[PDB]
Design an enzyme around this catalytic site. Structure first.
Site, mmCIF file in Angstrom:
data_model
loop_
_atom_site.group_PDB
_atom_site.id
_atom_site.type_symbol
_atom_site.label_atom_id
_atom_site.label_comp_id
_atom_site.label_asym_id
_atom_site.label_seq_id
_atom_site.Cartn_x
_atom_site.Cartn_y
_atom_site.Cartn_z
ATOM 1 N N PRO A 106 0.846 -1.185 0.000
ATOM 2 C CA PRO A 106 0.000 0.000 0.000
ATOM 3 C C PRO A 106 0.888 1.243 0.000
ATOM 4 O O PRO A 106 1.862 1.320 0.759
ATOM 5 C CB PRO A 106 -0.828 -0.127 1.259
ATOM 6 N N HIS A 107 0.581 2.207 -0.861
ATOM 7 C CA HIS A 107 1.379 3.420 -0.935
ATOM 8 C C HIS A 107 1.285 4.273 0.324
ATOM 9 O O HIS A 107 0.324 4.214 1.089
ATOM 10 C CB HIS A 107 1.001 4.256 -2.146
ATOM 11 N N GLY A 108 2.320 5.086 0.519
ATOM 12 C CA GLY A 108 2.423 5.999 1.619
ATOM 13 C C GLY A 108 2.872 5.448 2.945
ATOM 14 O O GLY A 108 2.517 6.046 3.974
ATOM 15 N N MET A 109 3.644 4.363 2.984
ATOM 16 C CA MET A 109 4.091 3.805 4.242
ATOM 17 C C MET A 109 5.411 4.320 4.778
ATOM 18 O O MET A 109 5.493 4.501 6.006
ATOM 19 C CB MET A 109 4.170 2.271 4.217
ATOM 20 N N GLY A 110 6.440 4.496 3.959
ATOM 21 C CA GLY A 110 7.730 4.960 4.520
ATOM 22 C C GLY A 110 7.730 6.469 4.674
ATOM 23 O O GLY A 110 6.806 7.094 4.149
ATOM 24 N N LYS A 111 8.691 7.067 5.390
ATOM 25 C CA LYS A 111 8.680 8.538 5.478
ATOM 26 C C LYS A 111 9.096 9.122 4.139
ATOM 27 O O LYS A 111 8.531 10.133 3.707
ATOM 28 C CB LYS A 111 9.399 9.106 6.693
ATOM 29 N N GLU A 126 9.514 5.023 -9.960
ATOM 30 C CA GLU A 126 8.118 5.255 -10.304
ATOM 31 C C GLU A 126 8.030 6.060 -11.591
ATOM 32 O O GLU A 126 8.645 7.125 -11.702
ATOM 33 C CB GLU A 126 7.522 6.045 -9.138
ATOM 34 N N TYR A 161 -8.819 9.593 -8.259
ATOM 35 C CA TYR A 161 -9.361 10.110 -7.008
ATOM 36 C C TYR A 161 -10.573 10.984 -7.241
ATOM 37 O O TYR A 161 -11.556 10.861 -6.494
ATOM 38 C CB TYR A 161 -8.285 10.786 -6.167
ATOM 39 N N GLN A 173 -6.395 2.124 -15.127
ATOM 40 C CA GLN A 173 -5.443 1.091 -14.739
ATOM 41 C C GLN A 173 -4.649 0.535 -15.906
ATOM 42 O O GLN A 173 -3.526 0.060 -15.694
ATOM 43 C CB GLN A 173 -6.136 -0.027 -13.961
ATOM 44 N N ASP A 202 10.389 -0.064 -8.342
ATOM 45 C CA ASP A 202 9.343 0.642 -7.620
ATOM 46 C C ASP A 202 8.034 -0.013 -8.135
ATOM 47 O O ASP A 202 7.499 0.374 -9.164
ATOM 48 C CB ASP A 202 9.306 2.133 -7.850
ATOM 49 N N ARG A 203 7.569 -1.015 -7.415
ATOM 50 C CA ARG A 203 6.383 -1.770 -7.701
ATOM 51 C C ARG A 203 6.580 -2.833 -8.782
ATOM 52 O O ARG A 203 7.499 -2.837 -9.588
ATOM 53 C CB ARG A 203 5.160 -0.903 -8.052
ATOM 54 N N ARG A 239 1.380 9.258 8.181
ATOM 55 C CA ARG A 239 2.437 9.373 7.173
ATOM 56 C C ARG A 239 1.902 9.681 5.792
ATOM 57 O O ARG A 239 2.497 10.454 5.025
ATOM 58 C CB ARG A 239 3.273 8.104 7.260
ATOM 59 N N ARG A 298 2.199 13.381 2.706
ATOM 60 C CA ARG A 298 2.628 13.417 1.301
ATOM 61 C C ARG A 298 1.420 13.201 0.394
ATOM 62 O O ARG A 298 1.156 12.149 -0.182
ATOM 63 C CB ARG A 298 3.791 12.515 0.981
ATOM 64 N N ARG A 335 -0.105 13.424 -2.880
ATOM 65 C CA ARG A 335 0.348 13.616 -4.247
ATOM 66 C C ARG A 335 -0.587 14.465 -5.087
ATOM 67 O O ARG A 335 -1.740 14.700 -4.738
ATOM 68 C CB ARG A 335 0.643 12.275 -4.918
ATOM 69 N N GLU A 393 -4.342 13.721 -5.523
ATOM 70 C CA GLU A 393 -4.774 12.704 -4.586
ATOM 71 C C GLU A 393 -5.675 13.248 -3.483
ATOM 72 O O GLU A 393 -5.532 14.378 -3.020
ATOM 73 C CB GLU A 393 -3.556 11.986 -3.972
HETATM 74 C C1 LIG Z 1 0.355 1.383 -8.816
HETATM 75 C C2 LIG Z 1 -0.942 2.104 -8.732
HETATM 76 C C3 LIG Z 1 -1.104 3.175 -7.898
HETATM 77 C C4 LIG Z 1 -0.003 3.714 -7.009
HETATM 78 C C5 LIG Z 1 0.344 5.197 -7.223
HETATM 79 C C6 LIG Z 1 0.370 5.540 -8.711
HETATM 80 C C7 LIG Z 1 -0.654 6.155 -6.539
HETATM 81 O O1 LIG Z 1 -1.871 6.007 -6.514
HETATM 82 N N1 LIG Z 1 -0.229 7.504 -6.422
HETATM 83 C C8 LIG Z 1 1.077 7.912 -6.849
HETATM 84 O O2 LIG Z 1 1.279 9.089 -7.123
HETATM 85 N N2 LIG Z 1 2.091 6.933 -7.005
HETATM 86 C C9 LIG Z 1 1.760 5.517 -6.636
HETATM 87 C C10 LIG Z 1 1.808 5.391 -5.083
HETATM 88 O O3 LIG Z 1 2.827 4.471 -4.775
HETATM 89 N N3 LIG Z 1 -2.336 3.849 -7.831
HETATM 90 C C11 LIG Z 1 -3.446 3.449 -8.622
HETATM 91 O O4 LIG Z 1 -4.502 4.066 -8.534
HETATM 92 N N4 LIG Z 1 -3.290 2.342 -9.486
HETATM 93 C C12 LIG Z 1 -2.045 1.630 -9.580
HETATM 94 O O5 LIG Z 1 -2.074 0.689 -10.373
#
Ligand SMILES: Cc1c(C[C@@]2(C)C(=O)NC(=O)N[C@H]2CO)[nH]c(=O)[nH]c1=O
Ligand SMILES: Cc1c(C[C@@]2(C)C(=O)NC(=O)N[C@H]2CO)[nH]c(=O)[nH]c1=O
Ligand SMILES: Cc1c(C[C@@]2(C)C(=O)NC(=O)N[C@H]2CO)[nH]c(=O)[nH]c1=O
Ligand SMILES: Cc1c(C[C@@]2(C)C(=O)NC(=O)N[C@H]2CO)[nH]c(=O)[nH]c1=O
EC number: 2.7.1.21
Lengths: 309, 310, 310, 309
Positions: free
Chosen positions: C12-17, C38, C56, C80, C113-114, C167, C171, C173, C176
């Site tokens: 899940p995004h947004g875990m590390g600082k 990324e 979003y 997607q 990165d993913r 956290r 950040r 984005r 978002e």
């Molecule tokens: C990988 C992925 C993300 C992840 C990403 C693209 C996210 O939402 N926002 C961002 O700016 N970078 C990533 C966060 O790690 N989000 C999404 O909706 N579909 C996906 O397939």
């Protein structure tokens, strides 16, 4: 699901067990009863060379004063691992196929020549009485006894010492006395535990057979009394926790078993018909999957082929 | 019912700067984390006299040609019965308290100094590679490995051989001999153990791949199964006897359900402490069967430590 | 032929600082470790205009009742396709250079990165839980997950929800929206992903356990398979259509061979850097097919970074 | 091992493909040839509601000026995922059963109604020429094309535009032109790549059909020329690496395929006998295990039952 009946014939050697079992198997049909025989091939060739001759030589050596007690113990202990391999591996692969208990016909009846406790408890304990094994080693084997599967029916034997001796003579009399005592203690131990006996509660009563009938036996007449040797006790007089835990394992493993006594002081046919009657009130179990029956049969037959001569 | 987290620190001995038990003591100061230390007292006194010394002496005498291979095997097999006793007894009393898995903090975190497989599989296998144990005795011990219960988390170490040799040379235990052949043997067995769990978790079927030993997952040649291609286990036509094939089935079944976590020991004791604790985040937790299962475990651990750990 | 170590940082995004890419840059200063950051440029410019913002916004409008569920699904499915493009293209050009496993240091360590599963499985599944994607579209993406090659090491994170919320709030984005329902959805999907790999590695057979959804390893109720019990995938008698059952077979096959490593993010960026590197010790390495496979990968990574990473 | 023959009938709609395939299947025996039909049930009901009607409505909308290009693209793109699901899942589960190439009878012949590239390359590209899809989305689908399994025989069709139009009229003429162009480009693309063509080497030649015969075509007559749109290029005039990589994937996937042209400008029986002859020189493959054949048959039949009407 189909039901399974597992019966382990055990107790001291020379009472008429193999004959009795063979006569039992003979009465049934080809596919409704399989016999897992004595794995003599494993003990003489597959697991090591002449494991039984090796065991009897060592005892004589020690008796003779040719070797020390420590040396005898290392050999017996090492030999017992070889001895119980077949019983243990068989139990391990059989285990996944055993379901819950049903009630005292079965699709398949499995008659085994001995149970894992013969090698992991009874012979080791008898060697301890003979002085060729330490009590700590005995408890080490006790600690490895596999979880008791549901429907564990064990048949022990009763034969007058003179009749047994007379018969067994075509000669370690001490070993015969020690093995008979151990199996006598084993029967009382099961009764004691099923009558609500608690070894910890009665430990202090120590100082100085019916497996499913009669009153609660005194702890002094059960297997627990073999384990009060100085080696296991501490400076305060009581036993060490490691050993006390081993005793708990022993209590847990024997507790759920269903043991029966078979009077061998009869003719071969009498023994067979006595055993037959005894199987009527034994606990059966279901099998995990539909194909368990066939697989159990193949397992037994393969054991007989590869390991029983 | 509360949740439990069992963590078995294992692998080739002598990897961290502090021992496994010393590291354990450092972590066992939180009230939510108890340890089961090395049962040294049992090995040197209780179970028998100086068992580790006997082992190394015996190997050394075998190497020098003073005793036969069969004489070493008898001593080593008997020695391993004594070495694993405490682990086997620990597993059997703890087993009934372990319930099913929970999912991906826990009420209690139990950290052990080794798991029954080190005394029942790994050490014996290493001794087989050293010529001091028969392959049949090794499969007999394998046949007695207690069923693998849910939440069996086993930490194995990673450490470059020269650093391992160095670190092991600084803590020579009572009666131990610095043997590079045994270090190779034991390191190989643990590397093969790690590969075997992977092999099995990825679809590996030992019976199906057996042929590849004589002509995505690790090749069977890189798993513990290669060790059992030994001639003592084969019939005249090269087939593995069924007794032994069944022991391999048991081995397959016991390992597959274990969760292996690798700990990099090439760092300081503090680092290894942090690392280990970090590793707990991906470990599997289980539920306990009764409400009074927490205390029983704590007391077990405390009594064990007090009596067998010095 | 030299050895390669592929590490896919995911979860899940947004875990590390710091972000995954920022952490990556910190590690990509050794000459034996290159990163694939990324592809932000592709998502905001190259592939389409502000794709994350669109996602979003769309969810927010669905929640407010301004657009229909079907209208959101169309936007989200198309979004997607665009999000995973770079990952899919990366996998397909790198695939031919990946050989068989080696065993348990590597010539080159590639840190991504993913992985394609986040854009092909995890995000879509989360959106299904949010009502913005049909379960059929999710299985269509699952049906296109590239075959799992040897040495597929995937790092997922562990972090308490409140700390994650905190956290993530620092950040936000471009485009978002801080959505707690999506955070729950995405955290659940990754937890289920972790459980699913375990389930499968331990013997799990989805077809055999399917019945348990309507009446040692995780229960199928705690794996990704529970998500596909959705009514849109079932025939009138409750049976799963075969098209979808085949997608689950593919899912089972793709996941089972992946090696999941859990990274505790509840610490500092430095800590997460050490942890990650420590984790590499138990990761699987592979051999490369040609002698010039090292350079191709390096250039791929460098060109990728330069062009799509800012 | 037994051998398998996979044949994918594809190309523009309305040429006589279904009839031809059905006539082919009819000649063989029950079990030596299975047909994986058009999965119309998935497109109308299982994966979504009326996916084809939805696609044709959107085009009309855009053509009419009722919606924007951006909106049309979101719909087409989302619809294409639904469209290709059956082809893709089928390829994924089929994959493990395909062994190495053998040589140009087979135990089982599988005739498919279209190949994954129809949904992941051809229709998307045709919609891009129609203005309802962006080139980036097309390349996103291209990047997901599954690895080309050995023995991938694809049969395309040739039919004069007047004959095709005449026939197709019981009417988007643009879409018909766009789909015919795309399949024409596809055939040249395979030839180009098998004649050693390198798109990177010839990229600069862009500015301003036989799939297994003839000379090397000019890149300008292959699929690569669709991807030189401003959206994919940078300020320096060249294409971006992400897209260039997608082009490489396209080259890799099409490269190993064996494509054949079937003249549909004949009677139903003529087409069938023309197709039959064409299958003689097609590449067959072995199957991974003994039980692959039966499993492939069950898979095909189940697909036909559940998804083909
Ligand atoms: C990988 C992925 C993300 C992840 C990403 C693209 C996210 O939402 N926002 C961002 O700016 N970078 C990533 C966060 O790690 N989000 C999404 O909706 N579909 C996906 O397939
Ligand atoms: C089972 C067993 C025996 C019992 C056996 C192996 C023995 O003594 N001799 C033999 O002919 N067969 C059996 C007797 O029924 N003996 C022994 O030392 N350890 C054991 O574990
Ligand atoms: C666990 C084990 C060890 C491991 C032990 C007992 C070892 O050798 N020396 C020591 O003092 N403590 C341990 C090191 O971690 N050694 C051995 O021979 N058999 C076994 O079974
Ligand atoms: C394969 C395909 C088609 C082709 C199909 C689905 C179509 O247009 N109409 C129909 O009746 N069956 C086929 C024609 O042979 N159309 C489309 O938009 N995307 C695709 O991916």
């Amino acid at each position: 699901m189909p039901t399974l009946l597992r019966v382990y014939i055990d107790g001291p050697h020379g009472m008429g067990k193999t004959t009795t079992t063979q006569l039992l198997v003979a009465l049934g049909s080809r596919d409704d009863i399989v016999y897992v025989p004595e794995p003599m091939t494993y003990w003489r060739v597959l697991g090591a060379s002449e494991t039984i001759a090796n065991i009897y030589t060592t005892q004589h050596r020690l008796d003779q004063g040719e070797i020390s007690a420590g040396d005898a113990a290392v050999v017996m202990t090492s030999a017992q691992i070889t001895m119980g391999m077949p019983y243990a591996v068989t139990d391990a692969v059989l285990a996944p196929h055993i379901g819950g208990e049903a009630g005292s016909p079965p699709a398949l009846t499995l008659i085994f020549d001995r149970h894992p406790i013969a090698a992991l408890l009874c012979y080791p304990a008898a060697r301890y009485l003979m002085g060729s094994m330490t009590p700590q080693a005995v408890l080490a084997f006790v600690a490895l006894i596999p979880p008791t599967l549901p429907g564990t029916n064990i048949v022990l034997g009763a034969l007058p010492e003179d009749r047994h001796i007379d018969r067994l003579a075509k000669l370690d009399l001490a070993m015969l006395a020690a093995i008979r005592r151990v199996y006598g203690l084993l029967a009382n131990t099961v009764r004691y535990l099923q009558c609500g006996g608690s070894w910890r509660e009665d430990w202090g009563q120590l100082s100085g057979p019916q497996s499913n009938a009669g009153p609660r036996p005194h702890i002094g007449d059960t297997l627990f009394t073999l384990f009060r040797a100085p080696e296991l006790l501490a400076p305060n007089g009581d036993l060490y926790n490691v050993f006390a835990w081993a005793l708990d394992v022993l209590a847990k493993r024997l507790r759920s078993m269903h043991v029966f006594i078979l009077d061998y002081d009869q003719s071969p046919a009498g023994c067979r018909d006595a055993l037959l009657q005894l199987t009527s009130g034994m606990v059966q179990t279901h099998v995990t999957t539909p194909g368990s029956i066939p697989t159990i049969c193949d397992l037994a037959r393969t054991f007989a082929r590869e390991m029983g001569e």
